[PDB]
From a paper:
Photosystem II (PSII) produces dioxygen by extracting electrons and protons from water, which takes place at the oxygen-evolving complex (OEC), an oxo-bridged Mn4CaO5 cluster with a shape that resembles a distorted chair. In conjunction with the oxidation of the OEC, protons are released in a 1:0:1:2 stoichiometry for the S0–S1, S1–S2, S2–S3 and S3–(S4)–S0 transitions, and two water molecules are split to produce a dioxygen in the S3–(S4)–S0 transition, after which the OEC returns to its most reduced S0 state. Here we use pump-probe serial femtosecond crystallography to reveal the structural dynamics of PSII from nanoseconds to milliseconds after illumination with one flash (1F) or two flashes (2F).
Difference densities on YZ and D1-Q165 increase at Δt2 = 1 µs, and the YZ–D1-H190 distance increases slightly from Δt2 = 0 to Δt2 = 1 µs. At Δt2 ≤ 1 µs, there are no difference densities among the neighbouring water molecules of O6*, indicating that O6* does not originate from any stable water molecules nearby. The deprotonation of water most likely occurs at Δt2 = 200 ns–1 µs, during which time the simultaneous existence of YZ•+/YZ• and OEC+ might collectively promote the deprotonation of the O6* precursor. Consequently, the resulting OH− ion binds to Ca, neutralizing the positively charged OEC+. At Δt2 = 1 μs, W2 and D1-D61 become unstable, as indicated by the negative difference densities on them, which might be attributable to the release of a proton from the precursor of O6* during this period. Another structural change occurring at Δt2 = 1 μs is the movement of the D1-H332 to D1-A336 backbones towards the OEC, which probably occurs owing to structural changes in the OEC.
Numbering used by the authors:
A (entry chain D): 11 to 352
B (entry chain A): 11 to 344
C (entry chain F): 12 to 45
D (entry chain C): 23 to 473
E (entry chain E): 4 to 84
F (entry chain V): 1 to 137
């Protein structure tokens, strides 16, 4: 059977400069629209009616302060379809109500699905194991938990991260003040996975580059490697002795070494995603009850834990009126927490 | 074979289970001193007047801390940058009140860890290796110098050095944001690119090499037994890896030279962390992140807020609350 | 010898055509006064 | 194209300047062309600063780093550091700019026109990196030049108008230095001071007599050692301790420059004698003490007894004791009590700040100086918004001390990395394994196993 | 290789540059005019410097209803006189 | 909203005469204020003495009143304490003390009017932000 399905399959999988594939039907429009939506919004679209903020090059923001901001809190978790009951097919209103945000988030989510399908598709055609796709589940877990599950647990999309450099920084600081997110052990594991991944990246790169075999005469050692050579280009035996004597332990199985390099950052991101699922419900690691009972009763008891809560309280009271304008917070000067003088 | 030559041949011997070396002669006593003091102080040290206002902060386990809240507390603001060894105190009880232990730990640690870097150079010379693994280690080492030494120098006190503890780290980071807006500094942003990128490329390289392992095992055994320590032949097919990844993106976005690939793995996080360290070190001298507070103004002159101004609101709350009893005059100039 | 209109040609231009248009729009914004 | 591709030289283009290692004639050109770049920047930057300079604003409000260097030497300024004549700034810039063309000319000639190697053309200018006698002789020539340079500063100070003295009675003035400190216990005593708070190593030099006498000692020492290294060749203990190669020599200098960059970073951050605050703005310690002083003065004028005002913590609101008893300013500036400055020292007694002088002898010029330095604290953003990170836009200011300190820390750090890079490579190249491990001779395969 | 013409071939060819010395500046100018004619403001609904606020008000025109949000913005736009 | 002549109309003196500044004067006032004054008065506060700000309500209760052009121009010539009892030229920049505050040497009478105008117009724009300090940033 060589029907139209099989002929289409032929064309989708041609060896061209940009492989397309069946996965490409999902991947390419969704990635392109998500990227074009972010560039369109950061260049031209305001956040005045949803946040009370300027947020586009048009308004005078720069690369650090432009954003595609989340919709107004009053939209709830609305899909905010262009043809939906809020914008009612009006493109200009849609932009003013935050329709670009759900547009980017949703085309982005389906774009990410399409990229991971692409990793499976190409891997099956070339004949390799699909571990690169398996590794990409960690970025997907992060995107889905932070940009979708987290706001879905909260009151509205407004509290999702906005798509911008400084807007994401605000998101970091909000998570410290309101959630005490540095205290959360699922974040701690994520930090370990990311910093340990960066560590493994640097050390393995440096170990290979400094246990190279002399396979050429030039002082530039890059030329003395051939992609189809059968020999290892660096000395596993010398690398193992160096680290055993510097550090006490070393790798001895190169297949374990590279699996571990997959394992560490991937597991870390997955752990951080679980903690954010909890924060969707405000199920925080905010306090240590034992510390609070002691400190309530003993005004001489002070730790770095109690000091940081005071900082969190400052963040909440000083940023909440501007950061949550729909709540209409009026905090007179006299209720604001402040140390002496400052 | 006199006794000095014998000692030198033992110190520099490549047959010791752990290499000693001349750097190791400094490294071992200083690291031992810093480690022993850290463990004892973390468990049992009494509270410490970090900010010099007779307001001691409890850092140890026996005085009410758990693993997450505990810390070795930085030395007193009254001491500033003065040297405070045990023998400058009238008693151990004084030394402990004033944060003596913090100085002893970090000075021994910074010495020991600098010698750790020299030791990496030294063993590579004895084994006939190329010498630059220690250049990769200079990036974490510079970062430790930034938060334990350079930042106190510029701010004028070891009491603004990073505490030796988990929650103390977070305190250091939060106050740093209030006083320098580090998130808006391009060197911290390059640092984030260094570690996010380094973790990305870590999983990238791990998954590609793992995806192209050459079949050497049955399905009931670990694929790891398909590699034998010291074997001459490579254990994966880099041509197949390049064939996959080149099609994932495009052909010329993919490495086929293992040497330049592994150099890129080395350089990206190391350079990024160098910039992170230089961020901390230059904000030590108060060259702070970008300030776009009230940068956008309308036709009449009303301030139009941006996300930068929301950051500023957060930073103010951090500023007005930190060290709540330590400021008498309106400007926190250091 | 070579074709002119390929998949690669389309991919290049869906990116490059809006980029130039946007760069002109952002260039003009540098002369807006309040 | 002698050694001008990767095949002939072994070095790729991105290490292309390594192709010069044994081409002394082209290497001379590279060095002379580069010195011209340095002299160019010095001349052009000065002219730029002068063009952009308004004499009624303090230098430190104008982004100036070179004019403060010239003014400190006593050119163009009078009492209080006021600018009386900008023509010396013009001269210094013009003469540097003109000279860079001479150096640019020599550099371009030797680099692309003259003899590629110098050994055939002249045995005086020729050299072999491994010739320990020729290398120490070239080193000796340059030590003599440096020694003369240090004596030019002495000549300016003692015979050609003097130096700007921030400490001069009457508010700061240019002063001829007639008795420079020659006592080697003073001069070399600076070298044995602790580098920690209250001591400050050589960064603590606080008077021009010591600055000038130190340059007399350094000039003599450099000239002597320069003669010594022309006449001698390295001894056996030195021969066995070092690597003798171009790259090795480069790496020693990189280590030395890195060390000096770190010292310069601290000099400009703490020292207000050879970096006068009139020109560079107040130090960080200085501005923080000036805030305490400003509010002691304000509150005392309103009727406060500042000696006995107990602050919220139990420590004095305005005044307290240092850990050794000296009377010092209170609040967070307690960390800065080691600060010494001309506007503050009149209030100082044997026991530290004197309450009687505080009550009766504070002059309006001290109130002025303290308010000016409190509001020009060296804090500001990368886009030059002055003040704490939470301040709003209005004031276009970053102190010269922050510019000079941050740039020289960054430079010193990378120069330390460069030392490690080239010292490690020099060692490996000398021993013969900088291109990789020889497969047939892998040293680890001849060693006993660890376990 | 995948069969398409090398990029270095194309972008050093006179014909490439004859075509693109027109199409590139023409797009740039189209983008400039999208802003300079004020059309970008009206397509996307972005305030001009003089239309964030009414002359004496200092409250944000914040959307507060889900299904009448369109009418709320339109009402905020009328009140600009 | 726009910078209108109404916004730019400010009290000239205590008797109720107004003067209408141009946009050029206002913008010149802002630049000269930044040049000579904002190091202590950024945003309408006073960093070396926060008890006294540049709010119009605060200026109206100074002695003599400073909430109009003539009072502010006189202050920049011969500043006084808030109750008028003392002359503070020796510690506050003014034309009288331009020898010790060199930045005042190149200010002309026209400049003083523009600075004065900026100080009186800005609260009409910024409201509580002017003289309010960090609470209103
Ligand atoms: C893994 C890889 C996956 C790859 C990516 C896949 C991308 C797919 C994209 C799908 C996007 C789903 C959009 C969900 C929108 C939503 O939920 O919208 C929410 C709505 C409910 O609407 C909300 O309802 C709330 C409760 O109201 C109720 O209570 C009110 C107050 O008392 C009133 O009574 C009111 O009338 C009554 O309706 C409020 O009204 C909110 O403002 C309103 O937004 O549910 C609904 O649409 C449907 C709810 C049922 C289905 C939920 C399943 C999907 C979500 C799972 C996440 C769990 C999150 C829980 C926290 C953890
Ligand atoms: C070969 C290598 C061998 C190694 C030797 C190891 C031995 C110890 C090393 C030194 C340790 C230094 C720690 C303290 C540094 C410091 O507090 O520095 C400050 C001092 C200056 O001291 C200050 O100096 C001041 C002097 O000013 C005084 O005098 C002035 C005169 O005008 C003014 O009046 C002023 O107001 C007044 O206070 C005061 O004394 C202060 O209290 C005092 O703190 O700097 C100085 O001594 C000079 C600068 C020293 C270098 C700074 C170290 C930087 C290292 C970076 C490493 C990065 C590595 C990365 C790895 C990858
Ligand atoms: C200060 C910076 C500096 C200096 C002084 C040099 C100097 C040199 N380089 Mg190096 N190099 C540098 C930076 C520098 N380089 C950088 C950044 C790179 C990376 C791209 C390299 C990569 C590199 C490689 C790969 C090679 C060199 C080589 C050389 C040498 C021969 C150059 C030649 O023959 O060109 C000939 C070029 C021309 C004739 C074109 C014009 C050149 C002139 C000098 C321009 C001067 C313009 C100036 C304004 C005129 C002023 C005149 C006025 C004063 C009267 C020369 C000594 C070569 C070498 O080692 O030979 C053995 C070599 O192969 N360099
Ligand atoms: C006096 C200082 C000095 C001197 C004379 C040398 C000389 C040399 N170096 Mg060393 N190096 C130094 C300092 C120095 N280095 C420092 C401080 C570092 C740490 C970063 C290094 C790190 C280093 C490495 C890693 C390597 C060398 C190498 C070399 C050799 C080849 C150099 C070359 O052709 O580069 C060519 C120059 C370039 C390709 C240009 C680099 C572009 C830089 C990064 C831009 C920097 C940005 C700029 C400051 C600001 C932005 C500008 C932009 C906005 C336009 C040559 C002998 C190579 C070697 O080992 O050979 C034996 C080599 O692999 N150097
Ligand atoms: C010692 C070096 C040094 C220092 C401390 C200063 C300091 C200053 N300059 Mg000067 N200047 C310098 C060198 C320096 N400059 C050089 C080399 C040039 C020629 C390009 C100039 C030309 C110049 C002009 C034309 C002007 C100044 C101005 C100023 C003032 C404002 C600076 C500013 O806003 O920067 C903004 C900050 C940046 C642009 C940050 C740059 C970040 C770099 C690219 C990072 C580099 C890192 C490292 C080097 C690379 C490592 C790479 C790694 C792979 C190894 C300030 C006093 C201004 C002024 O006020 O004049 C009165 C002014 O208009 N300078
Ligand atoms: C340190 C820098 C330096 C060094 C070591 C050399 C070395 C050399 N040059 Mg080069 N050259 C230089 C810089 C340098 N030059 C500069 C700046 C220029 C432009 C002026 C030239 C232009 C040049 C040309 C056109 C020629 C040379 C030639 C030579 C070779 C023979 C020169 C001779 O025998 O003079 C003998 C010594 C003297 C005549 C004494 C000169 C005293 C000077 C002029 C007075 C100043 C002395 C004082 C220390 C200067 C302080 C300057 C300081 C402030 C920067 C020799 C290898 C020749 C060559 O290559 O032959 C093939 C040749 O034809 N040079
Ligand atoms: C650029 C300057 C310079 C350079 C590169 C050299 C280089 C050299 N000198 Mg020369 N020397 C110089 C200036 C210089 N000298 C000057 C100005 C004088 C006159 C005072 C001398 C007088 C001199 C003599 C008498 C001798 C040398 C010798 C040597 C050779 C061995 C150096 C050595 O082993 O150091 C290593 C340094 C030491 C071994 C010092 C002891 C180690 C201490 C503990 C290190 C402490 C470091 C610590 C961080 C210090 C910080 C600052 C401190 C002051 C507080 C080497 C070629 C030797 C030689 O072979 O002559 C032919 C020799 O005998 N030099
Ligand atoms: C710090 C060195 C200052 C500079 C620069 C300027 N001013 Fe100032 N101002 C300062 C102080 C400490 C005070 C209080 C003085 C007192 O003891 O009463 C003031 C006061 C004023 C006032 C009076 C405010 C009021 O009465 O509410 C005005 C109108 C004023 N200052 C204006 C002003 C101008 C126009 C300046 C630039 C030319 C300027 N000041 C600079 C401190 C400092
Ligand atoms: C949304 C939407 C849509 C779409 C649209 C689109 C698709 C768009 C696209 C767009 C685009 C597509 C745009 C673009 C732009 C671009 C740009 C704007 C760029 C710029 C660049 C630059 C600026 C650069 C810079 C740099 C860097 C980055 C680095 C290197 C160096 C330099 C500096 C060069 C539709 C219609 C469907 C519907 C509705 C909605
Ligand atoms: C070798 C080489 C190189 C380098 C080069 C160089 C580095 C050079 C330099 C050069 C130089 C370094 C030059 C200089 C020049 C200068 C000049 C030419 C000047 C002139 C001047 C004048 C003309 C002046 C004028 C004036 C006056 C007198 C007055 C005031 C005003 C004015 C300014 C107008 C390269 C890398 C490229 C590569 C290749 C090789
Ligand atoms: C001017 C002045 C002054 C003076 C100064 C002086 C007098 C100085 C001196 C200086 C000096 C006098 C210095 C020295 C230095 C030294 C060094 C820096 C060394 C080093 C060493 C080394 C590096 C070694 C190494 C090694 C070892 C250890 C082992 C064996 C091998 C080797 C060799 C590698 C004063 C302050 C008064 C004042 C101000 C001005
Ligand atoms: C959804 C796709 C399901 C394939 S459907 C399938 O397509 C063939 C083409 O090969 C036809 O020949 C056949 O009649 C048709 O049923
Ligand atoms: Cl204080």
């Amino acid at each position: 059977e060589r029907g139209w399905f099989d002929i289409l399959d032929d064309w989708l999988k041609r060896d061209r400069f940009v492989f397309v594939g069946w996965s490409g039907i999902l991947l390419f429009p969704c990635a392109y629209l998500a990227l074009g939506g972010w560039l369109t919004g950061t260049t031209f679209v305001t956040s005045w009616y949803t946040h009370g903020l300027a947020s586009s090059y048009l308004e005078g923001c720069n690369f650090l302060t432009v954003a595609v901001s989340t919709p107004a809190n009053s939209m709830g978790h609305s899909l905010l379809l262009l043809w939906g009951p809020e914008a009612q097919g009006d493109f200009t209103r849609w932009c003013q109500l935050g329709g670009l945000w759900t547009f980017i988030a949703l085309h982005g989510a389906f774009g990410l699905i399409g990229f991971m399908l692409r990793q499976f598709e190409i891997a099956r055609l070339v004949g390799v194991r699909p571990y690169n796709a398996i590794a990409f589940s960690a970025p997907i877990a992060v995107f889905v938990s932070v940009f979708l599950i987290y706001p879905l647990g909260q009151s509205s999309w407004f509290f999702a991260p906005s798509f911008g450099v400084a807007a994401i920084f605000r998101f970091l600081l909000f998570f410290q003040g309101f959630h005490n997110w540095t205290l959360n052990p699922f974040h701690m594991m994520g930090v370990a996975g990311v910093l340990g991944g960066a560590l493994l990246c640097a050390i393995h790169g440096a170990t290979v580059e400094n246990t190279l075999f002399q396979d050429g005469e030039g002082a530039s050692t890059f030329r003395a490697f051939n992609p189809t050579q059968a020999e290892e280009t660096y000395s596993m035996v010398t690398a193992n002795r160096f680290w055993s004597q510097i550090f006490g332990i070393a790798f001895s199985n190169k297949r374990w070494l590279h699996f571990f390099m997959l394992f560490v950052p991937v597991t870390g991101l997955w752990m951080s995603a679980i903690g954010v699922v909890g924060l969707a419900l405000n199920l925080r690691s905010y306090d240590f009850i034992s510390q609070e009972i002691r400190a309530a009763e003993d005004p001489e008891f002070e730790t770095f834990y109690t000091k940081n809560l005071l900082l969190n309280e400052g963040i909440r009271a000083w940023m909440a009126p501007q950061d949550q304008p729909h709540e209409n917070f009026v905090f007179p000067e006299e209720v604001l927490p402040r140390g002496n003088a400052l | 074979a006199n006794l000095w030559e014998r000692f030198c041949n033992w110190v520099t011997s490549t047959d010791n289970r752990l290499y000693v070396g001349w750097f190791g002669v400094i490294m071992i006593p200083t690291l031992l001193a810093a480690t022993i003091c850290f463990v004892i102080a973390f468990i049992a040290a009494p509270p410490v007047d970090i900010d010099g206002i007779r307001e001691p902060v409890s850092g140890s386990l026996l005085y009410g801390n758990n693993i997450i809240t505990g810390a070795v507390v930085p030395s007193s603001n009254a001491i500033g940058l003065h040297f405070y060894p045990i023998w400058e105190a009238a008693s151990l009880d004084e030394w402990l009140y004033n944060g003596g232990p913090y100085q002893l730990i970090i000075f021994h640690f910074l010495l020991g860890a600098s010698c750790y870097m020299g030791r990496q150079w030294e063993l590579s010379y004895r084994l006939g290796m190329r010498p630059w693994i220690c250049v990769a280690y200079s990036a974490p080492l510079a970062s430790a110098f930034a938060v334990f030494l350079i930042y106190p120098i510029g701010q004028g006190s070891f009491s603004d050095g990073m505490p030796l503890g988990i929650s103390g780290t977070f305190n250091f980071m939060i106050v740093f944001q209030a006083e320098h807006n580090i998130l808006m500094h391009p060197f911290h942003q390059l640092g984030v690119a260094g570690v996010f990128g380094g973790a990305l490329f870590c999983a990238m390289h791990g998954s590609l090499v793992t995806s192209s392992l050459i079949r050497e095992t049955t399905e009931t055994e670990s694929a790891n037994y398909g590699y034998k320590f010291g074997q001459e032949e490579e254990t994966y097919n880099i041509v197949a890896a390049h064939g996959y990844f080149g099609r994932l993106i495009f052909q010329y976005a993919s490495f086929n030279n293992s040497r330049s690939l592994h150099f890129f793995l080395a350089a990206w996080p190391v350079v990024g962390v160098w910039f992170a360290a230089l961020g901390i070190s230059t904000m030590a001298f108060n060259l702070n992140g970008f300030n776009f507070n009230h940068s956008v103004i309308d036709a009449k002159g009303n301030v139009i807020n941006t996300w930068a101004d929301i950051i500023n609101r957060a930073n103010l709350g951090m500023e007005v609350m930190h060290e709540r009893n330590a400021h008498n005059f309106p400007l926190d100039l250091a | 010898s070579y074709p002119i209109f390929t998949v690669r040609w389309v991919a290049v231009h869906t990116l490059a055509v809006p980029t130039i248009f946007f760069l002109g729009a952002i260039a003009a914004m540098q002369f807006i006064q309040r | 194209a002698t050694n001008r591709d990767q095949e002939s030289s072994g070095f790729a283009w991105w290490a292309g300047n390594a192709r010069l290692i044994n081409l002394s004639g082209k290497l001379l050109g590279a060095h002379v062309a580069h010195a011209g770049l340095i002299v160019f920047w010095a001349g052009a930057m000065t002219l730029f600063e002068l063009a952009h300079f308004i004499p009624e604003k303090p230098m430190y409000e104008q982004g100036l780093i070179l004019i403060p260097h010239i003014a400190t030497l006593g050119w163009g300024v009078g009492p209080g550091g006021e600018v009386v004549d900008t023509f010396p700034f013009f001269v210094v810039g013009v003469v540097h700019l003109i000279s860079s063309a001479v150096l640019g000319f020599g550099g371009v000639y030797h680099a692309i026109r003259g003899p590629e190697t110098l050994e055939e053309y002249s045995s005086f200018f020729g050299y072999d990196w491994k010739d320990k006698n020729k290398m120490t002789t070239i080193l000796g020539f340059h030590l003599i030049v440096l020694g003369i340079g240090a004596l030019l500063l002495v000549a300016k100070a003692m015979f050609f108008g003097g130096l700007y003295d921030t400490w001069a009675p009457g508010g700061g003035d240019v002063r001829v230095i007639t008795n420079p400190t020659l006592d080697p216990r003073v001069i070399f005593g600076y070298l044995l001071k602790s580098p920690f708070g209250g001591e400050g190593w050589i960064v603590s030099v606080n008077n021009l007599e010591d600055v000038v006498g130190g340059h007399i000692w350094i000039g003599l020492i450099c000239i002597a050692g320069g003669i010594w290294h022309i006449l001698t060749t390295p001894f056996g203990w030195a021969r066995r301790a070092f690597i003798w190669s171009g790259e090795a020599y480069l790496s020693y200098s990189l280590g030395a420059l890195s060390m000096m960059g770190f010292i310069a970073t601290c000099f400009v951050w703490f020292n207000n004698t050879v970096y006068p605050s009139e020109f560079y703005g107040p130090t960080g310690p200085e501005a923080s003490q000036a805030q305490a002083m400003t509010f002691l003065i304000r509150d005392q004028k309103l009727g406060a007894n500042v000696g006995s005002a107990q602050g919220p913590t139990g420590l004095g609101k305005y005044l307290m004791r240092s850990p050794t008893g000296e009377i010092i300013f209170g609040g967070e500036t307690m960390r800065f009590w080691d600060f010494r400055g001309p506007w503050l020292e009149p209030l100082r007694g044997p026991n530290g700040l004197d309450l009687n002088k505080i009550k009766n002898d504070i002059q309006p010029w001290q109130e002025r100086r303290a308010a000016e330095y409190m509001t020009h604290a060296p804090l500001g953003s990368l886009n030059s918004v002055g003040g704490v990170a939470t301040e709003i836009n209005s004031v276009n200011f970053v102190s010269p001390r922050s510019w000079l300190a941050t740039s020289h820390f960054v430079l010193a750090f990378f120069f330390l990395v460069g030392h490690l890079w080239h010292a490690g490579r020099a060692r490996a190249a000398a021993a013969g394994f900088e291109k990789g491990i020889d497969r047939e001779s892998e040293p680890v395969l001849s060693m006993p196993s660890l376990d | 290789t995948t069969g398409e013409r090398p990029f270095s071939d194309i972008i050093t060819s006179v014909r490439y540059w004859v075509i693109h010395s027109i199409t590139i500046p023409a797009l740039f100018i189209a983008g400039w005019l999208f802003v300079s004619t004020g059309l970008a403001y009206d397509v996307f609904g972005t305030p001009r410097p003089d239309s964030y606020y009414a002359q004496e008000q200092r409250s944000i025109p914040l959307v507060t209803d889900r299904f009448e949000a369109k009418q709320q913005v339109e009402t905020f736009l009328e009140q600009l006189k | 909203a726009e910078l209108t002549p109404e916004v730019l109309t400010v009290p000239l003196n205590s008797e109720g005469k107004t003067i209408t500044l141009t946009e050029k004067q206002y913008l010149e006032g802002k630049r000269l204020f930044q040049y000579a004054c904002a190091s202590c008065h950024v945003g309408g506060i006073t960093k070396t003495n926060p008890s006294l700000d540049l709010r119009t309500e605060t200026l109206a209760l100074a002695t003599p009143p400073r909430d109009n052009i003539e009072g502010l121009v006189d202050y920049m010539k011969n500043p006084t304490t808030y109750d008028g009892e003392q002359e503070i030229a020796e510690v506050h920049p003014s034309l009288r003390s331009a020898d010790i505050f060199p930045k005042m040497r190149n200010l002309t009478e026209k400049d003083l009017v523009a600075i004065a105008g900026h100080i009186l117009v800005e609260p009409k724009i910024l409201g509580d932000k002017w003289g309010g300090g960090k609470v209103y940033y």
